[PDB]
Amino acid sequence: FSFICNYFKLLKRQGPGSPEATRKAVSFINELTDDAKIADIGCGTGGQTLFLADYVKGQITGIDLFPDFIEIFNENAVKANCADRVKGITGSMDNLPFQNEELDLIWSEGAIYNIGFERGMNEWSKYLKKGGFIAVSEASWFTSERPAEIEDFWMDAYPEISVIPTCIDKMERAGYTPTAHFILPENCWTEHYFAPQDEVRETFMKEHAGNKTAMDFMKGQQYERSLYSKYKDYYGYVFYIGQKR
């Protein structure tokens, strides 16, 4: 749980996605002013955060469990002349540091740990203002049944994975207007998630030859890719955008 996160500090992103993907998500929320308070829960290194900051106005707060990630986050915000509005702090997903009706937007791209789609939608809602938006990319099914292999893997990493209708149904239950939903372009995995893991893949080996667990980790990593190229028609990330009623 430690060493994992340490290897990810090297990548510019800890999960599928893309500028365009984060951009098409914002195209469904209402314009915000510099006064708007925004929150990216599970921001990680802030890869998507800066993409977001580029398309909206307001003050953004990044929140992640892993401090090393936040350390880089603020460093990236500074290197990007915007650490005045975009700030990062450690905290937990199930105990957010906010107040009722304080936020205008709740962003989260399934990065760094999780607490169940259903659970998040309800708990995070009391922080969002009325008419405020919630946008989150979540792994889901694209059909009513898939082969066993992909079925099992997911049912062992994140069992609350489900068909899109259920996700959309949980939203309305949580008090959201299902504004929009859309599947992240296949490129969000290959180019923007797997590819990056390549540069490092080489020197990672030399750097971690003998280490036994380091190797089991890689196989695990190379197992997602070979799992995606094989079943990408049965699953993937889906961006959900809903307005609090």
Walkthrough of the structure:
The protein is α/β, with parallel strands linked by helices. Helix content is 42%, strand content 23%. It is built from ten helices and eight strands. Strands 1, 2, 3, 4, 5, 6, 7 and 8 form an eight-stranded mixed sheet that branches. Helix 5 (117-125) packs parallel to helix 7 (164-174). The longest helix has 20 residues, at 212-231. The radius of gyration is 18 Å and the shape is globular. It is classed as transferase. The entry lists the keywords Rossmann fold, methyltransferase, S-Adenosyl methionine, S-Adenosyl-L-homocysteine, Methylation, transferase. It forms a monomeric assembly.
In helices, the fraction of residues equals 40-55%
Assign the CATH class.
Answer: Alpha Beta
Structural Rg:
18 Å
CATH topology: Rossmann fold
How much of the sequence lies in strands comes to 15-25%
- The N- to C-terminal Cα distance equals 38 Å
- CATH-defined superfamily: Vaccinia Virus protein VP39
Quickly count the domains: 1
The total count of helices amounts to 10
Main sheet specs: 8 strands, mixed
